[PDB]
């Protein structure tokens, strides 16, 4: 199953949001999955994770992740709105809707 | 002199733009002490900097640095606007008026 990679994902989101934080003070440092939107992709190469980026704001932020090597990897460089669209992901796990 | 102290406050600063620019990608990244404004109290225990935060964004946002066992930690309890305005400096390199 895929939710070890998944966890690997949101640690490395809380790792990098907690230190963003001290530069922007509005980052959320507690997101979690059950309050965020997940989909995996290419039997778990590409996740992609819709998180409440801004403790301030409702709205959802999509990042791309890449397992390689057994690590959880941001890449900017995919565009993950377009990602989702374009891929049948292999796992959904949808908490937050937005019409 | 304080510029050991103050170029590890750049080299800190910059890690965490760095890594903050992957989730909120409107922070700059690689900002330089010629485009800041820095300034050094307590003989080099606290260092404000003032720097250019956002790519988007002409402002100037304030940072206070303390300088402890050779380390520069970023301290967000001080604020270095009120620490500038109540404090002598031992030194300053204003660039941005």
């Known amino acids: 199953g895929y939710q070890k990679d998944i966890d690997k994902v949101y640690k490395e989101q809380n790792q990098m949001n907690k230190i963003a ?5 509005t980052i959320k440092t507690d997101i979690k999955q059950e309050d965020s939107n997940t989909h ?37 460089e995919i565009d993950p709105i377009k ?8 796992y959904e796990d949808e908490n937050v809707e937005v019409e």
């Open 83 to 90: 990602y989702m669209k374009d891929h049948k992901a292999d």
């Open 40 to 76: 995996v992709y290419k039997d778990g190469k590409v996740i992609v994770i819709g998180i409440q980026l801004y403790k301030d704001r409702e709205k959802m932020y999509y990042f791309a992740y890449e397992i390689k090597d057994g690590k959880a990897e941001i890449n900017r």
């Open 21 to 25: 934080s001290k530069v922007q003070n």
